[PDB]
Amino acid sequence: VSMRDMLKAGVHFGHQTRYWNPKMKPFIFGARNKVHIINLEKTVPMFNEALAELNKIASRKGKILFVGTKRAASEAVKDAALSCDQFFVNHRWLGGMLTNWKTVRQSIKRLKDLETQSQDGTFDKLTKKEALMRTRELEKLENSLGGIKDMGGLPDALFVIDADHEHIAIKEANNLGIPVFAIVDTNSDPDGVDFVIPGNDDAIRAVTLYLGAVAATVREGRSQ
Amino acid sequence: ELQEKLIAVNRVSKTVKGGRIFSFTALTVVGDGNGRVGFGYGKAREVPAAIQKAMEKARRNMINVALNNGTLQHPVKGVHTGSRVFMQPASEGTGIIAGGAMRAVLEVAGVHNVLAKAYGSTNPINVVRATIDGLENMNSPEMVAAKRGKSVEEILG
Amino acid sequence: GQKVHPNGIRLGIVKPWNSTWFANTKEFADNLDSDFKVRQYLTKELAKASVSRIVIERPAKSIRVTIHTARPGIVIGKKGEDVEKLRKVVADIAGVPAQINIAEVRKPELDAKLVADSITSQLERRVMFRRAMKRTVQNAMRLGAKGIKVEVSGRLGGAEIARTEWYREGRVPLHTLRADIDYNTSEAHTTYGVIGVKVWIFKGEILGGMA
RNA sequence: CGUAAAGCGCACGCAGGCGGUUUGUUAAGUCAGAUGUGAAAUCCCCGGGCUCAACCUGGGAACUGCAUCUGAUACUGGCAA
RNA sequence: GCGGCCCCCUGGACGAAGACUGACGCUCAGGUGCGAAAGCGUGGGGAGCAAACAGGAUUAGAUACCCUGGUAGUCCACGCCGUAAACGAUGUCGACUUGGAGGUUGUGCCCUUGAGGCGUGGCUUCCGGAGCUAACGCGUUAAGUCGACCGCCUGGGGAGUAC
Ligand SMILES: [Mg+2]
Ligand SMILES: [Mg+2]
Ligand SMILES: [Mg+2]
Ligand SMILES: [Mg+2]
Ligand SMILES: [Mg+2]
Ligand SMILES: [Mg+2]
Ligand SMILES: [Mg+2]
Ligand SMILES: [Mg+2]
Ligand SMILES: [Mg+2]
Ligand SMILES: [Mg+2]
Ligand SMILES: [Mg+2]
Ligand SMILES: [Mg+2]
Ligand SMILES: [Mg+2]
Ligand SMILES: [Mg+2]
Ligand SMILES: [Mg+2]
Ligand SMILES: [Mg+2]
Ligand SMILES: [Mg+2]
Ligand SMILES: [Mg+2]
Ligand SMILES: [Mg+2]
Ligand SMILES: [Mg+2]
Ligand SMILES: [Mg+2]
Ligand SMILES: [Mg+2]
Ligand SMILES: [Mg+2]
Ligand SMILES: [Mg+2]
Ligand SMILES: [Mg+2]
Ligand SMILES: [Mg+2]
């Protein structure tokens, strides 16, 4: 990615001065009109290093969990994660997805049971209303766990949009040693993130820029 | 293969409209006998279930300690709440000299020769935490040489 | 509160009747009385044979008794002798000729009656009620019960005030009519009175029903 | 030493305790070395004799001290700027 | 502790730019002084208020409680006393350590200045991170990180009592 490329998308904007985390001082270029301007000189090289590490992880059969639940970017995260044979969470992150992986496994088992049943049969052994009720349950479970339904085990890395928005997932990852790459705006706390990418986290264009770079590097690592 | 030791069992109670509800808590410590030790604390209505929850919790949340032939690298102080613990390396033959709460943790950890003493509150639950923290911050000559940018003998010799 | 008998509510849905014959009003009561006498005699005579279920059918002018037991060899004896004597006395009790068949229950730990009998026998033979009931659930879940619940009740261990205690693992939906819940009961006559033991075993649901 | 016992009601201020930074000098404190002395027994170490041990006993270490002399001058002190 | 306005005398604090002296500093046992209110001595003054008191409804009793008067006192001048939940229940001084929103009081620069935008000090209130604490909480005005000196503390009751 290019410095011009990020500046065009507007990565450099941040939140207001009154809403900021002091720990992000090194990555803040300054302020104009009472709004913080991030340092893209910090953004570009760190993003390249994150791409390199993600390339190694993906090249060793690594499982990558794309996480972002902002209503603005959820669809983009879903499509970008599916484009590269990886896993995503596009709705509200359930507290304990990683630390309560046992219960999430119970939910995945429920999903597999329901679809296997709905295709083998036994809905002809159930009232048409029971059939519809079980279908509705299956649909809800599919929405809840579609992106991780086939993850199988603990993920090997987390990519996060709006570290503050997804701090719970960052907390579970920190507890479980999973490396976190996170788009961290001026208002967020970068301590829990192994690889912090300092830049705008709201603009859909910038989100798509980050995600496209990540997906390209992941596919490079996958092709071998 | 890991060795597990139950340090203390205690009965707690909660009061509700109908009366007192009795429960139990279990404090256990698991270790590999070679420098890796974890502690667990579980709650349940019955003692065996409480102990089993404690064991499961204790297997995780475990840390590594850089032992030196069954003894510590250097004297160490640990502090948690009101439990101030002091440990020091000892010569061979001394064995485990410590109070019960520290004794179990050090035995399952593998420290064969150590002199220990607990000051202040001897509450087992906090004594175990302070011992674990003290043993965790204890560094080794190779790590301190790595930090200081020199070699081992450059510190030792 | 007070709950309906699981087998009673489920009869005709997912459970079969123990007695299966037709009779007009002129002989229905007589058949019931003969059935009661035959079942009583067989249960007492085979108390130590792990008999799980006595199905009495009345074909024409004859009576076929099928004994579901977990120990067929004891009931049969060397070359059928014991079956023969049981048949010869059941024929006496019934009046009409009698035939006896033996059905083995492959996994007794999933049979409610047999589980209750084991627990009752242990309690009479002086064992800890908690240990006994916990051991039967563990064995039931091991053998694969989708769910199991045991309830012991009344002067446990010789306590002056009777108390009720029950364990339950898995799922035992008693309001689901299509569920297969094998339920039975036993009483332990001990030196301090009667201790009642109820056992529910849930072993899956039945959709097609098949009555 | 906020609430468990424990900050004087508050301020000034004598005796006392401590004191910014540079240079010189002093050797008071400090450090090093040496000498004398620190009774013998007791404790400790290596041995020896009562058939073993207690016990007796040889040599040594120790007795962290005190005083004197010759050195070191970083730090504290004195004096001078 | 201080509350109409005015005058006379007086103390302290803060800021801007400089000039000057050159360690002259901090703390403090005993000591000295100030120290709300109630109180005591002398003499004034005495509107309102009001301990004590008196009366008015008042049961083996009026003590209560409520009303009607109401003295001491409250005020002044001078002495004494020297105690309070005299509390921020946080001894004095110095140094270092992420922020935010306010208040109050100086002062610099700049927009075209008034309004307005950029700083830079003092005091002060509320949130809050690290850290600390038994927790509660404290959090650049610390209860964090250290340094100097002082004042206390050592189970509760007896008792701040006896001599
Ligand atoms: Mg816990
Ligand atoms: Mg104590
Ligand atoms: Mg009913
Ligand atoms: Mg107190
Ligand atoms: Mg004070
Ligand atoms: Mg001096
Ligand atoms: Mg000096
Ligand atoms: Mg000298
Ligand atoms: Mg001597
Ligand atoms: Mg000898
Ligand atoms: Mg000798
Ligand atoms: Mg000097
Ligand atoms: Mg004084
Ligand atoms: Mg007065
Ligand atoms: Mg007077
Ligand atoms: Mg009046
Ligand atoms: Mg009055
Ligand atoms: Mg007067
Ligand atoms: Mg008093
Ligand atoms: Mg006082
Ligand atoms: Mg006051
Ligand atoms: Mg106040
Ligand atoms: Mg006080
Ligand atoms: Mg002073
Ligand atoms: Mg705060
Ligand atoms: Mg007194």
UniProtKB/Swiss-Prot annotation, chain A:
GO molecular function annotation: structural constituent of ribosome; zinc ion binding
GO cellular component: cytoplasm; cytosolic small ribosomal subunit
GO biological process entries: cytoplasmic translation; ribosomal small subunit assembly
Modified residues (N6-succinyllysine): K112
Keywords on record: Ribonucleoprotein, Ribosomal protein
Pfam families: Ribosomal_S2
Keyword Transferase belongs to the record: no
Gene3D superfamilies noted in UniProt: Glucose-6-phosphate isomerase like protein, domain 1, Helix hairpin bin
Function: Required for ribosomal protein bS1 (rpsA) to bind to the 30S subunit.
Similarity field: Belongs to the universal ribosomal protein uS2 family.
Subunit architecture: Part of the 30S ribosomal subunit, contacts bS1. Some nascent polypeptide chains are able to cross-link to this protein in situ. In collided ribosomes contacts ribosome rescue factor SmrB.
Protein name (record): Small ribosomal subunit protein uS2
Species this protein is from: Escherichia coli (strain K12)
Gene: rpsB
UniProtKB/Swiss-Prot annotation, chain B:
InterPro entries to which the protein is assigned, alphabetical: Ribosomal_Su5_D2-typ_SF (IPR020568), Ribosomal_uS5 (IPR000851), Ribosomal_uS5_bac-type (IPR005712), Ribosomal_uS5_C (IPR005324), Ribosomal_uS5_N (IPR013810), Ribosomal_uS5_N_CS (IPR018192), Ribsml_uS5_D2-typ_fold_subgr (IPR014721)
GO biological process terms, semicolon-separated: cytoplasmic translation; maintenance of translational fidelity; response to antibiotic; ribosomal small subunit assembly; translation
Impact upon substituting V12E: In strain: SPCR7; spectinomycin resistant. Not a ram mutation
Keywords, ordered alphabetically: Acetylation, Antibiotic resistance, Ribonucleoprotein, Ribosomal protein, RNA-binding, rRNA-binding
Record's function text: With uS4 and uS12 plays an important role in translational accuracy. Many suppressors of streptomycin-dependent mutants of protein uS12 are found in this protein, some but not all of which decrease translational accuracy (ram, ribosomal ambiguity mutations).
Alphabetized SUPFAM superfamilies for the sequence: dsRNA-binding domain-like, Ribosomal protein S5 domain 2-like
Keyword Glycoprotein in record: no
Protein name in the entry: Small ribosomal subunit protein uS5
Recorded name of the encoding gene: rpsE
GO CC aspect terms: cytoplasm; cytosol; cytosolic small ribosomal subunit
UniProt free text on domains: The N-terminal domain interacts with the head of the 30S subunit; the C-terminal domain interacts with the body and contacts protein uS4. The interaction surface between uS4 and uS5 is involved in control of translational fidelity.
Family in the record: Belongs to the universal ribosomal protein uS5 family.
Listed result of changing R103G: In strain: NEA-314; neamycin resistant
Classification via HAMAP family: Ribosomal_uS5_B
Record note on what altering R103S does: In strain: NEA-319; neamycin resistant
Further information: Altered uS5 proteins have been identified in a number of mutants. Some mutations in uS5 have been shown to increase translational error frequencies.
GO molecular function, one term: rRNA binding
Effect of R11L: In strain: SPCR9; spectinomycin resistant. Not a ram mutation
Species annotation: Escherichia coli (strain K12)
Keyword Ribonucleoprotein attributed: yes
Residues covered by the S5 DRBM domain: 2-65
NCBIfam families found in the cross-reference section: rpsE_bact
